[PDB]
Ligand binder design. Sequence first.
Ligand SMILES: O=C(O)/C=C/c1ccc(O)c(O)c1
Ligand SMILES: O=C(O)/C=C/c1ccc(O)c(O)c1
Length: 156
Amino acid sequence: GVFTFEDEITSTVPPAKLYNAMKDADSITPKIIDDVKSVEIVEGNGGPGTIKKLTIVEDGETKFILHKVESIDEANYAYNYSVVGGVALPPTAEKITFETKLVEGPNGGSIGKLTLKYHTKGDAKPDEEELKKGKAKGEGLFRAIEGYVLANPTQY
Ligand SMILES: O=C(O)/C=C/c1ccc(O)c(O)c1
Ligand SMILES: O=C(O)/C=C/c1ccc(O)c(O)c1
């Protein structure tokens, strides 16, 4: 089945700037997020169909995560990717999709809109715990991009 959740998050940074930073997330996230060590393009050119290997450290243990890039709408500050591999993905789960979109906040800031689509095998429902982890992963992504931008203002 497919189980669908939505979260939102605010920033002071405007969306255009924040979105350009999302594009460089493969180079940003390993710097600012401690667990993340690197992000390698394994197959593809960075566009839809691309597979990325993330290398995590979770309790002094090296783990891998595989992302599939699903779509990229730069007009709508949108970036959609799927977790398709690794330990972070549950054995009950076919895949987990992160659909991101930045939109304008009411003070010239921005609003991160996450739609999380958790694809299960058969009649399994998602684990309430792995939902907390998934939502948390998405926050840390956003905070990393935001942090990078605020710490490097001339960059964007
Ligand atoms: O966790 C959330 O609620 C939103 C996350 C989010 C939203 C938009 C982006 O461009 C992004 O990298 C992350
Ligand atoms: O939650 C995490 O720990 C890392 C998330 C992450 C890391 C690298 C990316 O390019 C991305 O879109 C998301």
